[PDB]
Amino acid sequence: IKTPSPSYLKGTNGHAILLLHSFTGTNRDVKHLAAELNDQGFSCYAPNYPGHGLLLKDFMTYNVDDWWEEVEKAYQFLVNEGYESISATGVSLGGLMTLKLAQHYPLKRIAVMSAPKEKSDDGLIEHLVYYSQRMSNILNLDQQASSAQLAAIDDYEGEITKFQHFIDDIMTNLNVIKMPANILFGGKDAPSYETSAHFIYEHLGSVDKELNGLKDSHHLMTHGEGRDILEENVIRFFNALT
Ligand SMILES: [Ca+2]
Ligand SMILES: [Ca+2]
Ligand SMILES: [Ca+2]
Ligand SMILES: [Ca+2]
């Protein structure tokens, strides 16, 4: 069991795209979309947030500051590789990281999928519970371990609060984001994500922005039903760079 390594696809057209995964996901969330973008000429880089891929008790020794530092590091990696054109896309937490990147750096364009405008403590705890169960049926861990993993959740309360403030600080300052933006949500996701997408769209500073609700897409828009429609949309959006 280890955190996956980053994935770097070198392309030919001189433009680079960061691809950022979901909360409790890994960079396998974005593998297919990265591959399809690379087949259109783009260089693609998909980091993995620290702690992601590990058992819950190890996962919770990392926090949103660690995850953001890794995203900063991934941006700098592309700068150091010589790319003058860098763009970003991400799903769920990765969509939040994309928005934050755009507040800090001169990204060329951004595509944001399934970003929330706020998260409750129950909602985030519920993500962590599902993560630990999926992992126990994979790793076929005994019953005793599973329960201890979930009992450590109580000590993460301060880090949940930090994550909530992280979201609030991004959402307060959407007006400083000015480059072209594609805001996407799934019509088979919770209705709060449609409300979030409208909020984000309406508060962005960008003059060149679009809102795309995809009726067949679920929360993890890169996977499952509707994925072909999502990919065509995102690829069309980034191909405007060429
Ligand atoms: Ca293909
Ligand atoms: Ca390829
Ligand atoms: Ca703690
Ligand atoms: Ca609607």
JSON list of C-alpha atoms and ligand atoms in Angstrom, two decimals:
[
{"chain": "A", "resi": 1, "resn": "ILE", "atom": "CA", "xyz": [0.00, 0.00, 0.00]},
{"chain": "A", "resi": 2, "resn": "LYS", "atom": "CA", "xyz": [1.47, 3.31, -1.08]},
{"chain": "A", "resi": 3, "resn": "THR", "atom": "CA", "xyz": [0.46, 6.69, -2.43]},
{"chain": "A", "resi": 4, "resn": "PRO", "atom": "CA", "xyz": [0.68, 6.45, -6.21]},
{"chain": "A", "resi": 5, "resn": "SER", "atom": "CA", "xyz": [3.40, 8.31, -7.99]},
{"chain": "A", "resi": 6, "resn": "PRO", "atom": "CA", "xyz": [2.62, 11.29, -10.22]},
{"chain": "A", "resi": 7, "resn": "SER", "atom": "CA", "xyz": [1.86, 10.73, -13.90]},
{"chain": "A", "resi": 8, "resn": "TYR", "atom": "CA", "xyz": [3.51, 12.89, -16.56]},
{"chain": "A", "resi": 9, "resn": "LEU", "atom": "CA", "xyz": [2.50, 12.61, -20.21]},
{"chain": "A", "resi": 10, "resn": "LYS", "atom": "CA", "xyz": [4.76, 14.58, -22.54]},
{"chain": "A", "resi": 11, "resn": "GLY", "atom": "CA", "xyz": [2.99, 16.07, -25.54]},
{"chain": "A", "resi": 12, "resn": "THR", "atom": "CA", "xyz": [4.04, 17.98, -28.60]},
{"chain": "A", "resi": 13, "resn": "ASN", "atom": "CA", "xyz": [2.06, 21.25, -28.80]},
{"chain": "A", "resi": 14, "resn": "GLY", "atom": "CA", "xyz": [3.86, 23.20, -26.05]},
{"chain": "A", "resi": 15, "resn": "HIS", "atom": "CA", "xyz": [0.82, 23.57, -23.76]},
{"chain": "A", "resi": 16, "resn": "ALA", "atom": "CA", "xyz": [0.62, 21.85, -20.39]},
{"chain": "A", "resi": 17, "resn": "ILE", "atom": "CA", "xyz": [-2.43, 20.89, -18.35]},
{"chain": "A", "resi": 18, "resn": "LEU", "atom": "CA", "xyz": [-2.50, 20.07, -14.66]},
{"chain": "A", "resi": 19, "resn": "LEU", "atom": "CA", "xyz": [-5.12, 17.49, -13.77]},
{"chain": "A", "resi": 20, "resn": "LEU", "atom": "CA", "xyz": [-6.28, 17.33, -10.13]},
{"chain": "A", "resi": 21, "resn": "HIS", "atom": "CA", "xyz": [-8.23, 14.50, -8.52]},
{"chain": "A", "resi": 22, "resn": "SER", "atom": "CA", "xyz": [-11.05, 14.21, -6.01]},
{"chain": "A", "resi": 23, "resn": "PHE", "atom": "CA", "xyz": [-11.13, 14.08, -2.21]},
{"chain": "A", "resi": 24, "resn": "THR", "atom": "CA", "xyz": [-10.31, 10.50, -1.13]},
{"chain": "A", "resi": 25, "resn": "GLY", "atom": "CA", "xyz": [-9.57, 9.67, -4.79]},
{"chain": "A", "resi": 26, "resn": "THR", "atom": "CA", "xyz": [-6.19, 9.23, -6.49]},
{"chain": "A", "resi": 27, "resn": "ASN", "atom": "CA", "xyz": [-4.75, 10.36, -9.82]},
{"chain": "A", "resi": 28, "resn": "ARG", "atom": "CA", "xyz": [-6.44, 7.32, -11.41]},
{"chain": "A", "resi": 29, "resn": "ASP", "atom": "CA", "xyz": [-9.51, 9.58, -11.29]},
{"chain": "A", "resi": 30, "resn": "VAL", "atom": "CA", "xyz": [-8.04, 11.52, -14.23]},
{"chain": "A", "resi": 31, "resn": "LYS", "atom": "CA", "xyz": [-6.01, 8.90, -16.12]},
{"chain": "A", "resi": 32, "resn": "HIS", "atom": "CA", "xyz": [-8.31, 8.56, -19.13]},
{"chain": "A", "resi": 33, "resn": "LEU", "atom": "CA", "xyz": [-8.88, 12.30, -19.56]},
{"chain": "A", "resi": 34, "resn": "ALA", "atom": "CA", "xyz": [-5.15, 12.94, -19.28]},
{"chain": "A", "resi": 35, "resn": "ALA", "atom": "CA", "xyz": [-4.46, 10.29, -21.93]},
{"chain": "A", "resi": 36, "resn": "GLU", "atom": "CA", "xyz": [-7.07, 11.74, -24.29]},
{"chain": "A", "resi": 37, "resn": "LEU", "atom": "CA", "xyz": [-5.73, 15.26, -23.87]},
{"chain": "A", "resi": 38, "resn": "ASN", "atom": "CA", "xyz": [-2.20, 14.01, -24.53]},
{"chain": "A", "resi": 39, "resn": "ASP", "atom": "CA", "xyz": [-3.39, 12.34, -27.72]},
{"chain": "A", "resi": 40, "resn": "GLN", "atom": "CA", "xyz": [-4.45, 15.82, -28.87]},
{"chain": "A", "resi": 41, "resn": "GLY", "atom": "CA", "xyz": [-0.89, 17.12, -28.32]},
{"chain": "A", "resi": 42, "resn": "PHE", "atom": "CA", "xyz": [-1.01, 18.39, -24.72]},
{"chain": "A", "resi": 43, "resn": "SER", "atom": "CA", "xyz": [1.46, 17.67, -21.96]},
{"chain": "A", "resi": 44, "resn": "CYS", "atom": "CA", "xyz": [-0.43, 16.48, -18.89]},
{"chain": "A", "resi": 45, "resn": "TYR", "atom": "CA", "xyz": [0.66, 16.21, -15.23]},
{"chain": "A", "resi": 46, "resn": "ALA", "atom": "CA", "xyz": [-1.48, 14.45, -12.61]},
{"chain": "A", "resi": 47, "resn": "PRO", "atom": "CA", "xyz": [-0.09, 14.60, -9.07]},
{"chain": "A", "resi": 48, "resn": "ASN", "atom": "CA", "xyz": [-1.47, 12.64, -6.12]},
{"chain": "A", "resi": 49, "resn": "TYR", "atom": "CA", "xyz": [-2.37, 14.42, -2.90]},
{"chain": "A", "resi": 50, "resn": "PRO", "atom": "CA", "xyz": [-0.31, 13.19, 0.08]},
{"chain": "A", "resi": 51, "resn": "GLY", "atom": "CA", "xyz": [-2.13, 10.63, 2.21]},
{"chain": "A", "resi": 52, "resn": "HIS", "atom": "CA", "xyz": [-4.46, 9.63, -0.58]},
{"chain": "A", "resi": 53, "resn": "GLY", "atom": "CA", "xyz": [-4.33, 5.89, -1.20]},
{"chain": "A", "resi": 54, "resn": "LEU", "atom": "CA", "xyz": [-3.50, 5.05, 2.41]},
{"chain": "A", "resi": 55, "resn": "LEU", "atom": "CA", "xyz": [-5.56, 3.56, 5.21]},
{"chain": "A", "resi": 56, "resn": "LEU", "atom": "CA", "xyz": [-7.72, 6.11, 7.00]},
{"chain": "A", "resi": 57, "resn": "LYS", "atom": "CA", "xyz": [-5.58, 6.49, 10.11]},
{"chain": "A", "resi": 58, "resn": "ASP", "atom": "CA", "xyz": [-2.53, 7.32, 7.95]},
{"chain": "A", "resi": 59, "resn": "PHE", "atom": "CA", "xyz": [-4.68, 9.45, 5.59]},
{"chain": "A", "resi": 60, "resn": "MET", "atom": "CA", "xyz": [-5.71, 11.67, 8.50]},
{"chain": "A", "resi": 61, "resn": "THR", "atom": "CA", "xyz": [-2.15, 12.60, 9.40]},
{"chain": "A", "resi": 62, "resn": "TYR", "atom": "CA", "xyz": [-2.21, 14.82, 6.30]},
{"chain": "A", "resi": 63, "resn": "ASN", "atom": "CA", "xyz": [-4.43, 17.87, 5.83]},
{"chain": "A", "resi": 64, "resn": "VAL", "atom": "CA", "xyz": [-5.50, 20.43, 3.27]},
{"chain": "A", "resi": 65, "resn": "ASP", "atom": "CA", "xyz": [-2.25, 22.35, 3.70]},
{"chain": "A", "resi": 66, "resn": "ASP", "atom": "CA", "xyz": [-0.32, 19.24, 2.61]},
{"chain": "A", "resi": 67, "resn": "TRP", "atom": "CA", "xyz": [-2.63, 18.73, -0.38]},
{"chain": "A", "resi": 68, "resn": "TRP", "atom": "CA", "xyz": [-2.29, 22.35, -1.53]},
{"chain": "A", "resi": 69, "resn": "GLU", "atom": "CA", "xyz": [1.50, 22.27, -1.15]},
{"chain": "A", "resi": 70, "resn": "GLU", "atom": "CA", "xyz": [1.63, 19.29, -3.50]},
{"chain": "A", "resi": 71, "resn": "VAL", "atom": "CA", "xyz": [-0.46, 21.18, -6.07]},
{"chain": "A", "resi": 72, "resn": "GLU", "atom": "CA", "xyz": [1.90, 24.16, -5.79]},
{"chain": "A", "resi": 73, "resn": "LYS", "atom": "CA", "xyz": [4.82, 21.78, -6.28]},
{"chain": "A", "resi": 74, "resn": "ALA", "atom": "CA", "xyz": [3.18, 20.31, -9.40]},
{"chain": "A", "resi": 75, "resn": "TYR", "atom": "CA", "xyz": [2.70, 23.76, -10.92]},
{"chain": "A", "resi": 76, "resn": "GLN", "atom": "CA", "xyz": [6.36, 24.61, -10.24]},
{"chain": "A", "resi": 77, "resn": "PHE", "atom": "CA", "xyz": [7.42, 21.32, -11.82]},
{"chain": "A", "resi": 78, "resn": "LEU", "atom": "CA", "xyz": [5.76, 22.40, -15.09]},
{"chain": "A", "resi": 79, "resn": "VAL", "atom": "CA", "xyz": [7.32, 25.84, -14.90]},
{"chain": "A", "resi": 80, "resn": "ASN", "atom": "CA", "xyz": [10.72, 24.25, -14.41]},
{"chain": "A", "resi": 81, "resn": "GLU", "atom": "CA", "xyz": [10.11, 21.93, -17.41]},
{"chain": "A", "resi": 82, "resn": "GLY", "atom": "CA", "xyz": [9.89, 25.08, -19.55]},
{"chain": "A", "resi": 83, "resn": "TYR", "atom": "CA", "xyz": [6.18, 25.36, -20.22]},
{"chain": "A", "resi": 84, "resn": "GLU", "atom": "CA", "xyz": [5.06, 28.95, -20.83]},
{"chain": "A", "resi": 85, "resn": "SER", "atom": "CA", "xyz": [1.42, 27.88, -21.22]},
{"chain": "A", "resi": 86, "resn": "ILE", "atom": "CA", "xyz": [-0.08, 26.10, -18.21]},
{"chain": "A", "resi": 87, "resn": "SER", "atom": "CA", "xyz": [-3.79, 25.35, -17.65]},
{"chain": "A", "resi": 88, "resn": "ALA", "atom": "CA", "xyz": [-5.58, 23.27, -15.05]},
{"chain": "A", "resi": 89, "resn": "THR", "atom": "CA", "xyz": [-8.65, 21.09, -14.59]},
{"chain": "A", "resi": 90, "resn": "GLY", "atom": "CA", "xyz": [-9.93, 19.09, -11.67]},
{"chain": "A", "resi": 91, "resn": "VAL", "atom": "CA", "xyz": [-12.91, 17.31, -10.16]},
{"chain": "A", "resi": 92, "resn": "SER", "atom": "CA", "xyz": [-14.41, 17.93, -6.70]},
{"chain": "A", "resi": 93, "resn": "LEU", "atom": "CA", "xyz": [-11.49, 18.89, -4.42]},
{"chain": "A", "resi": 94, "resn": "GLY", "atom": "CA", "xyz": [-9.41, 19.12, -7.58]},
{"chain": "A", "resi": 95, "resn": "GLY", "atom": "CA", "xyz": [-11.86, 21.68, -8.89]},
{"chain": "A", "resi": 96, "resn": "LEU", "atom": "CA", "xyz": [-11.31, 23.72, -5.73]},
{"chain": "A", "resi": 97, "resn": "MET", "atom": "CA", "xyz": [-7.53, 23.39, -6.16]},
{"chain": "A", "resi": 98, "resn": "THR", "atom": "CA", "xyz": [-7.90, 24.61, -9.76]},
{"chain": "A", "resi": 99, "resn": "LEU", "atom": "CA", "xyz": [-9.80, 27.70, -8.59]},
{"chain": "A", "resi": 100, "resn": "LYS", "atom": "CA", "xyz": [-7.13, 28.38, -5.93]},
{"chain": "A", "resi": 101, "resn": "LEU", "atom": "CA", "xyz": [-4.35, 27.97, -8.49]},
{"chain": "A", "resi": 102, "resn": "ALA", "atom": "CA", "xyz": [-6.07, 30.52, -10.68]},
{"chain": "A", "resi": 103, "resn": "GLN", "atom": "CA", "xyz": [-6.08, 33.04, -7.79]},
{"chain": "A", "resi": 104, "resn": "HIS", "atom": "CA", "xyz": [-2.30, 32.64, -7.41]},
{"chain": "A", "resi": 105, "resn": "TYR", "atom": "CA", "xyz": [-0.88, 32.02, -10.93]},
{"chain": "A", "resi": 106, "resn": "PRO", "atom": "CA", "xyz": [-1.35, 33.12, -14.61]},
{"chain": "A", "resi": 107, "resn": "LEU", "atom": "CA", "xyz": [-3.09, 29.99, -15.82]},
{"chain": "A", "resi": 108, "resn": "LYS", "atom": "CA", "xyz": [-4.25, 30.14, -19.43]},
{"chain": "A", "resi": 109, "resn": "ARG", "atom": "CA", "xyz": [-7.69, 28.61, -18.82]},
{"chain": "A", "resi": 110, "resn": "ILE", "atom": "CA", "xyz": [-9.41, 26.45, -16.25]},
{"chain": "A", "resi": 111, "resn": "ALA", "atom": "CA", "xyz": [-12.11, 23.75, -16.27]},
{"chain": "A", "resi": 112, "resn": "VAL", "atom": "CA", "xyz": [-13.77, 22.98, -12.95]},
{"chain": "A", "resi": 113, "resn": "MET", "atom": "CA", "xyz": [-15.90, 19.84, -12.39]},
{"chain": "A", "resi": 114, "resn": "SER", "atom": "CA", "xyz": [-18.23, 19.19, -9.42]},
{"chain": "A", "resi": 115, "resn": "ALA", "atom": "CA", "xyz": [-16.77, 21.86, -7.15]},
{"chain": "A", "resi": 116, "resn": "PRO", "atom": "CA", "xyz": [-18.74, 22.54, -3.93]},
{"chain": "A", "resi": 117, "resn": "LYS", "atom": "CA", "xyz": [-19.26, 26.04, -2.61]},
{"chain": "A", "resi": 118, "resn": "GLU", "atom": "CA", "xyz": [-19.31, 24.72, 0.98]},
{"chain": "A", "resi": 119, "resn": "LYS", "atom": "CA", "xyz": [-19.08, 21.42, 2.86]},
{"chain": "A", "resi": 120, "resn": "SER", "atom": "CA", "xyz": [-20.53, 20.44, 6.22]},
{"chain": "A", "resi": 121, "resn": "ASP", "atom": "CA", "xyz": [-18.79, 18.37, 8.88]},
{"chain": "A", "resi": 122, "resn": "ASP", "atom": "CA", "xyz": [-21.26, 15.50, 8.38]},
{"chain": "A", "resi": 123, "resn": "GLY", "atom": "CA", "xyz": [-20.72, 15.63, 4.63]},
{"chain": "A", "resi": 124, "resn": "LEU", "atom": "CA", "xyz": [-16.95, 15.39, 4.95]},
{"chain": "A", "resi": 125, "resn": "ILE", "atom": "CA", "xyz": [-17.02, 12.69, 7.64]},
{"chain": "A", "resi": 126, "resn": "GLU", "atom": "CA", "xyz": [-19.32, 10.72, 5.36]},
{"chain": "A", "resi": 127, "resn": "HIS", "atom": "CA", "xyz": [-16.69, 10.84, 2.59]},
{"chain": "A", "resi": 128, "resn": "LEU", "atom": "CA", "xyz": [-14.10, 9.45, 4.99]},
{"chain": "A", "resi": 129, "resn": "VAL", "atom": "CA", "xyz": [-16.37, 6.60, 6.13]},
{"chain": "A", "resi": 130, "resn": "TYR", "atom": "CA", "xyz": [-17.03, 5.43, 2.55]},
{"chain": "A", "resi": 131, "resn": "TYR", "atom": "CA", "xyz": [-13.31, 5.65, 1.80]},
{"chain": "A", "resi": 132, "resn": "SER", "atom": "CA", "xyz": [-12.43, 3.38, 4.72]},
{"chain": "A", "resi": 133, "resn": "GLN", "atom": "CA", "xyz": [-15.07, 0.77, 3.79]},
{"chain": "A", "resi": 134, "resn": "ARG", "atom": "CA", "xyz": [-14.07, 0.49, 0.12]},
{"chain": "A", "resi": 135, "resn": "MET", "atom": "CA", "xyz": [-10.47, 0.10, 1.28]},
{"chain": "A", "resi": 136, "resn": "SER", "atom": "CA", "xyz": [-11.31, -2.65, 3.77]},
{"chain": "A", "resi": 137, "resn": "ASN", "atom": "CA", "xyz": [-13.10, -4.74, 1.12]},
{"chain": "A", "resi": 138, "resn": "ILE", "atom": "CA", "xyz": [-10.13, -4.23, -1.23]},
{"chain": "A", "resi": 139, "resn": "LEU", "atom": "CA", "xyz": [-7.39, -4.93, 1.30]},
{"chain": "A", "resi": 140, "resn": "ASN", "atom": "CA", "xyz": [-9.76, -7.53, 2.78]},
{"chain": "A", "resi": 141, "resn": "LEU", "atom": "CA", "xyz": [-8.76, -6.25, 6.21]},
{"chain": "A", "resi": 142, "resn": "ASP", "atom": "CA", "xyz": [-10.15, -8.06, 9.23]},
{"chain": "A", "resi": 143, "resn": "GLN", "atom": "CA", "xyz": [-13.17, -6.71, 11.10]},
{"chain": "A", "resi": 144, "resn": "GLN", "atom": "CA", "xyz": [-11.18, -5.45, 14.10]},
{"chain": "A", "resi": 145, "resn": "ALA", "atom": "CA", "xyz": [-9.00, -3.11, 12.04]},
{"chain": "A", "resi": 146, "resn": "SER", "atom": "CA", "xyz": [-11.93, -1.54, 10.17]},
{"chain": "A", "resi": 147, "resn": "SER", "atom": "CA", "xyz": [-13.49, -0.28, 13.40]},
{"chain": "A", "resi": 148, "resn": "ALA", "atom": "CA", "xyz": [-10.28, 1.24, 14.78]},
{"chain": "A", "resi": 149, "resn": "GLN", "atom": "CA", "xyz": [-9.79, 3.10, 11.49]},
{"chain": "A", "resi": 150, "resn": "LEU", "atom": "CA", "xyz": [-13.21, 4.75, 11.81]},
{"chain": "A", "resi": 151, "resn": "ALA", "atom": "CA", "xyz": [-12.66, 5.57, 15.51]},
{"chain": "A", "resi": 152, "resn": "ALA", "atom": "CA", "xyz": [-9.69, 7.81, 14.61]},
{"chain": "A", "resi": 153, "resn": "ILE", "atom": "CA", "xyz": [-12.09, 10.14, 12.76]},
{"chain": "A", "resi": 154, "resn": "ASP", "atom": "CA", "xyz": [-12.85, 12.01, 16.00]},
{"chain": "A", "resi": 155, "resn": "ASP", "atom": "CA", "xyz": [-9.25, 13.34, 16.15]},
{"chain": "A", "resi": 156, "resn": "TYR", "atom": "CA", "xyz": [-9.56, 14.87, 12.66]},
{"chain": "A", "resi": 157, "resn": "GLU", "atom": "CA", "xyz": [-12.12, 17.49, 13.75]},
{"chain": "A", "resi": 158, "resn": "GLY", "atom": "CA", "xyz": [-9.66, 20.37, 13.67]},
{"chain": "A", "resi": 159, "resn": "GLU", "atom": "CA", "xyz": [-8.51, 19.39, 10.19]},
{"chain": "A", "resi": 160, "resn": "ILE", "atom": "CA", "xyz": [-12.14, 19.29, 9.02]},
{"chain": "A", "resi": 161, "resn": "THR", "atom": "CA", "xyz": [-12.56, 22.88, 10.22]},
{"chain": "A", "resi": 162, "resn": "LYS", "atom": "CA", "xyz": [-9.37, 23.87, 8.37]},
{"chain": "A", "resi": 163, "resn": "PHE", "atom": "CA", "xyz": [-10.76, 22.31, 5.18]},
{"chain": "A", "resi": 164, "resn": "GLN", "atom": "CA", "xyz": [-14.01, 24.25, 5.60]},
{"chain": "A", "resi": 165, "resn": "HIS", "atom": "CA", "xyz": [-12.11, 27.54, 5.96]},
{"chain": "A", "resi": 166, "resn": "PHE", "atom": "CA", "xyz": [-9.99, 26.59, 2.92]},
{"chain": "A", "resi": 167, "resn": "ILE", "atom": "CA", "xyz": [-13.16, 26.37, 0.81]},
{"chain": "A", "resi": 168, "resn": "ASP", "atom": "CA", "xyz": [-14.55, 29.63, 2.24]},
{"chain": "A", "resi": 169, "resn": "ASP", "atom": "CA", "xyz": [-11.36, 31.55, 1.46]},
{"chain": "A", "resi": 170, "resn": "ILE", "atom": "CA", "xyz": [-11.46, 30.37, -2.19]},
{"chain": "A", "resi": 171, "resn": "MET", "atom": "CA", "xyz": [-15.12, 31.13, -2.62]},
{"chain": "A", "resi": 172, "resn": "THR", "atom": "CA", "xyz": [-14.84, 34.61, -1.10]},
{"chain": "A", "resi": 173, "resn": "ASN", "atom": "CA", "xyz": [-12.41, 35.69, -3.84]},
{"chain": "A", "resi": 174, "resn": "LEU", "atom": "CA", "xyz": [-13.73, 34.28, -7.09]},
{"chain": "A", "resi": 175, "resn": "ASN", "atom": "CA", "xyz": [-13.80, 37.78, -8.57]},
{"chain": "A", "resi": 176, "resn": "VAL", "atom": "CA", "xyz": [-9.99, 37.74, -8.96]},
{"chain": "A", "resi": 177, "resn": "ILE", "atom": "CA", "xyz": [-10.16, 34.84, -11.41]},
{"chain": "A", "resi": 178, "resn": "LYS", "atom": "CA", "xyz": [-10.21, 36.35, -14.86]},
{"chain": "A", "resi": 179, "resn": "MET", "atom": "CA", "xyz": [-9.02, 33.82, -17.44]},
{"chain": "A", "resi": 180, "resn": "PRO", "atom": "CA", "xyz": [-11.39, 31.73, -19.56]},
{"chain": "A", "resi": 181, "resn": "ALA", "atom": "CA", "xyz": [-13.32, 29.23, -17.45]},
{"chain": "A", "resi": 182, "resn": "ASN", "atom": "CA", "xyz": [-15.55, 26.19, -18.04]},
{"chain": "A", "resi": 183, "resn": "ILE", "atom": "CA", "xyz": [-17.70, 25.31, -15.00]},
{"chain": "A", "resi": 184, "resn": "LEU", "atom": "CA", "xyz": [-19.18, 21.80, -15.21]},
{"chain": "A", "resi": 185, "resn": "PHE", "atom": "CA", "xyz": [-21.55, 19.79, -13.05]},
{"chain": "A", "resi": 186, "resn": "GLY", "atom": "CA", "xyz": [-23.44, 16.53, -13.36]},
{"chain": "A", "resi": 187, "resn": "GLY", "atom": "CA", "xyz": [-27.22, 16.31, -13.54]},
{"chain": "A", "resi": 188, "resn": "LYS", "atom": "CA", "xyz": [-27.16, 13.01, -11.64]},
{"chain": "A", "resi": 189, "resn": "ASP", "atom": "CA", "xyz": [-25.05, 14.57, -8.84]},
{"chain": "A", "resi": 190, "resn": "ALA", "atom": "CA", "xyz": [-26.68, 16.04, -5.72]},
{"chain": "A", "resi": 191, "resn": "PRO", "atom": "CA", "xyz": [-28.62, 19.27, -6.40]},
{"chain": "A", "resi": 192, "resn": "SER", "atom": "CA", "xyz": [-26.21, 21.20, -4.18]},
{"chain": "A", "resi": 193, "resn": "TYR", "atom": "CA", "xyz": [-23.60, 20.82, -6.94]},
{"chain": "A", "resi": 194, "resn": "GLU", "atom": "CA", "xyz": [-25.88, 22.51, -9.48]},
{"chain": "A", "resi": 195, "resn": "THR", "atom": "CA", "xyz": [-26.38, 25.38, -7.02]},
{"chain": "A", "resi": 196, "resn": "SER", "atom": "CA", "xyz": [-22.63, 25.48, -6.40]},
{"chain": "A", "resi": 197, "resn": "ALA", "atom": "CA", "xyz": [-21.85, 25.64, -10.11]},
{"chain": "A", "resi": 198, "resn": "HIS", "atom": "CA", "xyz": [-24.21, 28.58, -10.64]},
{"chain": "A", "resi": 199, "resn": "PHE", "atom": "CA", "xyz": [-22.67, 30.36, -7.64]},
{"chain": "A", "resi": 200, "resn": "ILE", "atom": "CA", "xyz": [-19.15, 29.85, -8.96]},
{"chain": "A", "resi": 201, "resn": "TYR", "atom": "CA", "xyz": [-20.09, 30.91, -12.49]},
{"chain": "A", "resi": 202, "resn": "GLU", "atom": "CA", "xyz": [-21.87, 34.06, -11.32]},
{"chain": "A", "resi": 203, "resn": "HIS", "atom": "CA", "xyz": [-19.02, 35.20, -9.07]},
{"chain": "A", "resi": 204, "resn": "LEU", "atom": "CA", "xyz": [-16.09, 34.58, -11.39]},
{"chain": "A", "resi": 205, "resn": "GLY", "atom": "CA", "xyz": [-14.39, 37.66, -12.81]},
{"chain": "A", "resi": 206, "resn": "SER", "atom": "CA", "xyz": [-13.82, 36.00, -16.17]},
{"chain": "A", "resi": 207, "resn": "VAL", "atom": "CA", "xyz": [-15.47, 37.58, -19.18]},
{"chain": "A", "resi": 208, "resn": "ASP", "atom": "CA", "xyz": [-15.10, 34.31, -21.16]},
{"chain": "A", "resi": 209, "resn": "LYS", "atom": "CA", "xyz": [-16.91, 31.74, -19.03]},
{"chain": "A", "resi": 210, "resn": "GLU", "atom": "CA", "xyz": [-19.40, 28.96, -19.66]},
{"chain": "A", "resi": 211, "resn": "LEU", "atom": "CA", "xyz": [-21.65, 26.81, -17.49]},
{"chain": "A", "resi": 212, "resn": "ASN", "atom": "CA", "xyz": [-22.24, 23.23, -18.65]},
{"chain": "A", "resi": 213, "resn": "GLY", "atom": "CA", "xyz": [-24.65, 20.95, -16.85]},
{"chain": "A", "resi": 214, "resn": "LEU", "atom": "CA", "xyz": [-24.28, 17.46, -18.29]},
{"chain": "A", "resi": 215, "resn": "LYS", "atom": "CA", "xyz": [-27.50, 15.57, -17.70]},
{"chain": "A", "resi": 216, "resn": "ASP", "atom": "CA", "xyz": [-26.03, 12.06, -17.56]},
{"chain": "A", "resi": 217, "resn": "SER", "atom": "CA", "xyz": [-22.89, 12.78, -15.51]},
{"chain": "A", "resi": 218, "resn": "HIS", "atom": "CA", "xyz": [-22.48, 11.72, -11.88]},
{"chain": "A", "resi": 219, "resn": "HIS", "atom": "CA", "xyz": [-20.34, 13.47, -9.24]},
{"chain": "A", "resi": 220, "resn": "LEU", "atom": "CA", "xyz": [-17.06, 11.92, -10.45]},
{"chain": "A", "resi": 221, "resn": "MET", "atom": "CA", "xyz": [-17.69, 13.26, -13.96]},
{"chain": "A", "resi": 222, "resn": "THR", "atom": "CA", "xyz": [-14.53, 11.67, -15.36]},
{"chain": "A", "resi": 223, "resn": "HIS", "atom": "CA", "xyz": [-15.92, 8.17, -14.74]},
{"chain": "A", "resi": 224, "resn": "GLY", "atom": "CA", "xyz": [-18.91, 6.13, -15.77]},
{"chain": "A", "resi": 225, "resn": "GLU", "atom": "CA", "xyz": [-22.08, 7.20, -17.53]},
{"chain": "A", "resi": 226, "resn": "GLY", "atom": "CA", "xyz": [-21.70, 10.25, -19.72]},
{"chain": "A", "resi": 227, "resn": "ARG", "atom": "CA", "xyz": [-17.92, 10.32, -19.69]},
{"chain": "A", "resi": 228, "resn": "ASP", "atom": "CA", "xyz": [-17.63, 10.58, -23.48]},
{"chain": "A", "resi": 229, "resn": "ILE", "atom": "CA", "xyz": [-19.72, 13.76, -23.44]},
{"chain": "A", "resi": 230, "resn": "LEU", "atom": "CA", "xyz": [-17.66, 15.23, -20.58]},
{"chain": "A", "resi": 231, "resn": "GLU", "atom": "CA", "xyz": [-14.37, 14.48, -22.37]},
{"chain": "A", "resi": 232, "resn": "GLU", "atom": "CA", "xyz": [-15.52, 15.98, -25.70]},
{"chain": "A", "resi": 233, "resn": "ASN", "atom": "CA", "xyz": [-16.53, 19.13, -23.83]},
{"chain": "A", "resi": 234, "resn": "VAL", "atom": "CA", "xyz": [-13.27, 19.53, -21.91]},
{"chain": "A", "resi": 235, "resn": "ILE", "atom": "CA", "xyz": [-11.12, 18.70, -24.94]},
{"chain": "A", "resi": 236, "resn": "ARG", "atom": "CA", "xyz": [-12.98, 21.20, -27.12]},
{"chain": "A", "resi": 237, "resn": "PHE", "atom": "CA", "xyz": [-12.46, 23.81, -24.40]},
{"chain": "A", "resi": 238, "resn": "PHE", "atom": "CA", "xyz": [-8.71, 23.26, -24.18]},
{"chain": "A", "resi": 239, "resn": "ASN", "atom": "CA", "xyz": [-8.28, 22.94, -27.93]},
{"chain": "A", "resi": 240, "resn": "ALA", "atom": "CA", "xyz": [-9.07, 26.67, -28.13]},
{"chain": "A", "resi": 241, "resn": "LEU", "atom": "CA", "xyz": [-5.44, 27.14, -27.05]},
{"chain": "A", "resi": 242, "resn": "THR", "atom": "CA", "xyz": [-4.25, 25.72, -30.37]},
{"chain": "B", "resi": 1, "resn": "CA", "atom": "CA", "xyz": [-9.60, 8.18, -27.89]},
{"chain": "B", "resi": 2, "resn": "CA", "atom": "CA", "xyz": [-0.48, 9.57, -25.94]},
{"chain": "B", "resi": 3, "resn": "CA", "atom": "CA", "xyz": [-5.91, 16.47, 14.35]},
{"chain": "B", "resi": 4, "resn": "CA", "atom": "CA", "xyz": [-31.70, 22.34, -12.94]}
]
